[PDB]
Amino acid sequence: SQIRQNYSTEVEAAVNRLVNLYLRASYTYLSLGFYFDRDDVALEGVCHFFRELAEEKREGAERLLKMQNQRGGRALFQDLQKPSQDEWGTTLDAMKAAIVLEKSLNQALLDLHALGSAQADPHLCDFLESHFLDEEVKLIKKMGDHLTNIQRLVQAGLGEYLFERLTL
Amino acid sequence: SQIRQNYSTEVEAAVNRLVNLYLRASYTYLSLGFYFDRDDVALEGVCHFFRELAEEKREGAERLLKMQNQRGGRALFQDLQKPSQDEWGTTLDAMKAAIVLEKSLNQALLDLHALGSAQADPHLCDFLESHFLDEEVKLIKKMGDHLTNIQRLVQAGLGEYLFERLTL
Amino acid sequence: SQIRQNYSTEVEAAVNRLVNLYLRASYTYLSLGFYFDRDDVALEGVCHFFRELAEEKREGAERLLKMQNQRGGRALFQDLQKPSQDEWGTTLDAMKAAIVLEKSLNQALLDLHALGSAQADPHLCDFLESHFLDEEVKLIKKMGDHLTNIQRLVQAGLGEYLFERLTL
Amino acid sequence: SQIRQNYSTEVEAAVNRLVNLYLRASYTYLSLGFYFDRDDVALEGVCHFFRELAEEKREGAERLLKMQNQRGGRALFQDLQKPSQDEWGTTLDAMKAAIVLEKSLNQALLDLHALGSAQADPHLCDFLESHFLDEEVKLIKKMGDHLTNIQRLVQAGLGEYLFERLTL
Amino acid sequence: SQIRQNYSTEVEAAVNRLVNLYLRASYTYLSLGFYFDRDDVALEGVCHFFRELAEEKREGAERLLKMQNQRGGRALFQDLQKPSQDEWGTTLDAMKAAIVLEKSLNQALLDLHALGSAQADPHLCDFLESHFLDEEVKLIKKMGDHLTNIQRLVQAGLGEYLFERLTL
Ligand SMILES: FC(F)O[C@@H](Cl)C(F)(F)F
Numbered sequence: 001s002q003i004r005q006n007y008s009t010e011v012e013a014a015v016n017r018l019v020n021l022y023l024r025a026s027y028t029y030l031s032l033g034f035y036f037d038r039d040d041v042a043l044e045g046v047c048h049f050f051r052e053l054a055e056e057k058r059e060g061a062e063r064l065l066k067m068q069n070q071r072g073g074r075a076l077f078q079d080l081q082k083p084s085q086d087e088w089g090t091t092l093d094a095m096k097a098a099i100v101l102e103k104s105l106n107q108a109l110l111d112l113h114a115l116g117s118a119q120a121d122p123h124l125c126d127f128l129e130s131h132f133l134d135e136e137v138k139l140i141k142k143m144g145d146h147l148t149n150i151q152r153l154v155q156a157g158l159g160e161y162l163f164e165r166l167t168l
Numbered sequence: 169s170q171i172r173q174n175y176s177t178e179v180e181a182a183v184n185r186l187v188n189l190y191l192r193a194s195y196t197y198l199s200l201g202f203y204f205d206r207d208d209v210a211l212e213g214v215c216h217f218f219r220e221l222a223e224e225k226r227e228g229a230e231r232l233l234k235m236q237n238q239r240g241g242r243a244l245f246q247d248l249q250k251p252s253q254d255e256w257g258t259t260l261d262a263m264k265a266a267i268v269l270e271k272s273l274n275q276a277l278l279d280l281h282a283l284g285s286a287q288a289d290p291h292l293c294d295f296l297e298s299h300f301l302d303e304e305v306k307l308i309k310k311m312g313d314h315l316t317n318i319q320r321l322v323q324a325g326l327g328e329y330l331f332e333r334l335t336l
Numbered sequence: 337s338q339i340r341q342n343y344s345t346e347v348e349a350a351v352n353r354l355v356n357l358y359l360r361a362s363y364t365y366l367s368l369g370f371y372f373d374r375d376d377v378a379l380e381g382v383c384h385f386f387r388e389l390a391e392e393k394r395e396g397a398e399r400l401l402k403m404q405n406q407r408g409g410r411a412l413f414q415d416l417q418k419p420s421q422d423e424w425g426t427t428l429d430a431m432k433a434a435i436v437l438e439k440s441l442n443q444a445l446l447d448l449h450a451l452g453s454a455q456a457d458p459h460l461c462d463f464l465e466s467h468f469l470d471e472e473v474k475l476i477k478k479m480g481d482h483l484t485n486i487q488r489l490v491q492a493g494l495g496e497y498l499f500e501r502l503t504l
Numbered sequence: 505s506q507i508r509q510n511y512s513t514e515v516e517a518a519v520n521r522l523v524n525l526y527l528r529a530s531y532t533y534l535s536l537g538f539y540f541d542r543d544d545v546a547l548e549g550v551c552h553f554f555r556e557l558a559e560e561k562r563e564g565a566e567r568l569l570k571m572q573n574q575r576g577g578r579a580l581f582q583d584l585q586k587p588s589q590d591e592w593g594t595t596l597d598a599m600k601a602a603i604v605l606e607k608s609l610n611q612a613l614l615d616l617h618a619l620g621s622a623q624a625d626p627h628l629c630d631f632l633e634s635h636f637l638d639e640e641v642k643l644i645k646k647m648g649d650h651l652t653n654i655q656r657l658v659q660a661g662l663g664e665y666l667f668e669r670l671t672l
Numbered sequence: 673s674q675i676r677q678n679y680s681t682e683v684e685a686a687v688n689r690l691v692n693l694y695l696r697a698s699y700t701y702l703s704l705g706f707y708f709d710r711d712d713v714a715l716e717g718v719c720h721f722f723r724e725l726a727e728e729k730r731e732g733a734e735r736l737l738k739m740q741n742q743r744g745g746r747a748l749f750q751d752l753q754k755p756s757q758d759e760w761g762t763t764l765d766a767m768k769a770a771i772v773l774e775k776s777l778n779q780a781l782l783d784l785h786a787l788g789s790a791q792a793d794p795h796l797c798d799f800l801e802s803h804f805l806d807e808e809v810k811l812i813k814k815m816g817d818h819l820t821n822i823q824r825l826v827q828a829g830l831g832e833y834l835f836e837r838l839t840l
């Protein structure tokens with residue numbers, strides 16, 4: 001590429017992976033959201049929480065794709081694997097699954113930053129710090145807070161309703 | 169009738185039945201609503217939910233009557249039977265009764281649409297699709313959602329209060 | 337499902353397929369859009385055209401998922417295959433690919449409608465007619481119009497720039 | 505200096521160089537802009553593009569000078585060499601020259617960041633990341649996009665007019 | 673001091689103590705607030721209640737310091753001891769600790785007023801009555817009210833969530 005400068009093939013490849021990870025995460029949150037919209041689950045606030053996260057992850061992928069092009073790298077898309085479950089259990093089960101997923105994304109970001117540091121790619125490092133690293137930390141904190149409140153509330157049926165009504 | 173075109177006597181008759189069904193449903197919801205206004209039941213949100221549905225069903229009947237005249241059919245009214253119960257039990261009992269009633273109306277709509285299809289009456293089919301079929305599906309979904317939440321909440325007294333307060 | 341009425345397993349399954357088709361189409365348009373954002377392609381209007389279509393297809397999938405739940409069917413997600421190309425050639429090549437894709441979606445909608453008709457499922461038929469069938473026809477017409485204008489313009493470089501500048 | 509803390513003489517010196525580089529770049533863009541204002545060149549949009557870049561580079565130098573003082577370093581100004589050409593040829597020639605110049609500035613920024621990293625000077629690293637690194641990447645991307653469009657348009661006279669009219 | 677009139681060394685010294693008491697109380701409420709911000713405690717309303725009290729106590733200290741100077745006394749600051757606990761247990765445990773702390777401050781105010789009365793220092797007495805005595809009484813009443821409601825609510829997990837959601 002005529003514009004490419006200080007952008008390693010290793011980072012370019014890792015950015016394409018991370019795009020796949022973010023799209024997979026978006027797809028997982030789509031499945032989570034619609035599960036809580038089932039007539040036999042029916043927790044609207046939980047559905048909305050996860051549908052909003054699907055949008056956020058999709059937007060993350062799009063930001064990574066924009067940055068890939070800005071640096072002169074080439075987007076390469078792969079098959080998106082379906083989410084790990086078809087049914088997600090209770091709000092607690094779902095929130096546990098979500099925090100596992102976010103920590104997996106956070107670790108991928110951290111690995112990419114480490115790669116960027118090893119390749120002396122300060123633009124990549126700043127890009128990650130500006131748009132992803134703090135967003136992941138804040139989100140993981142919020143999920144941790146939710147998990148604690150859900151757990152405190154488990155008369156499990158009543159607790160799950162009250163959390164959806166009064167927190168989400 | 170000078171305006172009547174492609175409107176079978178079978179459909180005309182079935183439209184008069186459906187009007188009776190919708191009026192009966194309106195009357196049932198009137199009884200449900202006022203039961204929840206009793207001083208010894210006293211669930212205002214439940215009362216309002218059912219009184220609003222009484223209005224909606226009445227409006228459905230009126231739309232069917234307007235369409236009957238637009239097509240050149242003749243309204244024929246019959247006795248309206250009283251609702252199936254005088255007392256409706258808990259919110260859960262009442263919501264179960266309501267979903268049974270809505271499914272009965274939905275089936276009558278579907279039968280009428282099938283009749284219209286067999287009689288090649290596209291105006292009837294569109295009329296049903298525009299004003300009734302989707303409205304029934306959405307309402308039945310909402311009642312299903314409510315039933316699930318009520319069931320999750322059954323410390324039955326506390327649950328019933330919380331549902332009325334925080335959902336209805 | 338407590339709400340399920342007149343909703344065949346065949347339609348439920350076909351709705352899940354169609355969701356996969358719409359998500360695949362969204363992913364294809366994401367790849368198309370970002371290809372035209374490459375520094376060595378650099379056609380902003382083409383990029384925006386396809387990114388908007390990615391959003392529209394995603395929204396279609398979401399509407400199908402909402403309807404699935406409203407009817408008491410169960411969402412089942414599958415792997416999403418990657419788009420058919422990594423690089424999309426010229427605006428003309430891309431628009432040809434897009435119209436092929438839209439016709440494939442349109443045919444899937446038509447097949448689903450035929451299935452609904454055979455299963456006497458008027459709610460499905462109306463749902464498709466209200467939110468998808470006319471939208472597909474209008475979009476395919478617009479792409480046809482674009483294809484004709486692109487073709488007329490092929491001094492191919494100059495033509496492609498002018499189309500992006502003055503139409504897109 | 506009474507305020508100086510963790511600010512190496514190597515960085516201070518490199519900041520003075522970079523100021524000279526940014527001022528030289530501002531001067532180059534001044535020459536580019538006024539060349540396109542010649543009555544025998546007469547491409548107003550190209551002139552404006554380069555005059556705006558002259559302002560941006562001057563502002564970059566001023567930000568570096570402000571930071572130098574904030575850290576307790578001492579500005580040292582050197583002769584500013586005249587631009588590499590007196591006449592800049594076509595829009596394409598000029599845009600090629602501009603991207604070469606921007607890549608040279610970007611490399612100087614990257615070298616300075618590497619120096620800051622080796623000297624453990626996190627304030628310098630953040631300063632560069634906040635105000636320069638992303639700005640260079642975005643600008644180089646935009647020039648790459650322009651180069652591609654100019655090249656596609658080369659009936660060279662007609663192409664150059666159309667680019668100036670419809671992009672710049 | 674040129675302005676000092678009717679201001680005993682005993683009162684001046686006791687005012688410096690009280691400043692230390694108010695600052696210690698501010699520090700205690702800072703620790704309480706951030707404990708309830710822990711991901712494994714996660715009671716936002718409780719955190720906010722205590723952070724607001726930290727601000728109020730700090731402001732009390734500042735008012736005492738302003739009055740000290742107005743009277744011609746001399747501020748003398750001492751080490752601020754860390755709060756009595758690192759972890760504060762439940763909302764109930766924390767509210768009990770808070771009311772103990774407020775009663776300790778109230779007693780210090782009362783002692784200071786008694787000192788002022790014995791020293792015939794009416795300005796001090798009015799100062800205390802205007803800005804502190806009623807504020808302490810109102811706050812202690814509110815905490816008592818909260819303690820009663822928390823106690824009534826102890827299904828301890830559910831109670832603690834509901835108090836935070838619906839009172840704080
Ligand atoms: F197909 C993609 F563009 O969107 C993905 Cl994330 C999907 F999950 F919504 F399917």
Ligand SMILES: FC(F)O[C@@H](Cl)C(F)(F)F
Nearest residue numbers: 527528530531532534562
């Ligand atoms: F003389 C400088 F202040 O401005 C430089 Cl940058 C010039 F290029 F405009 F001359």
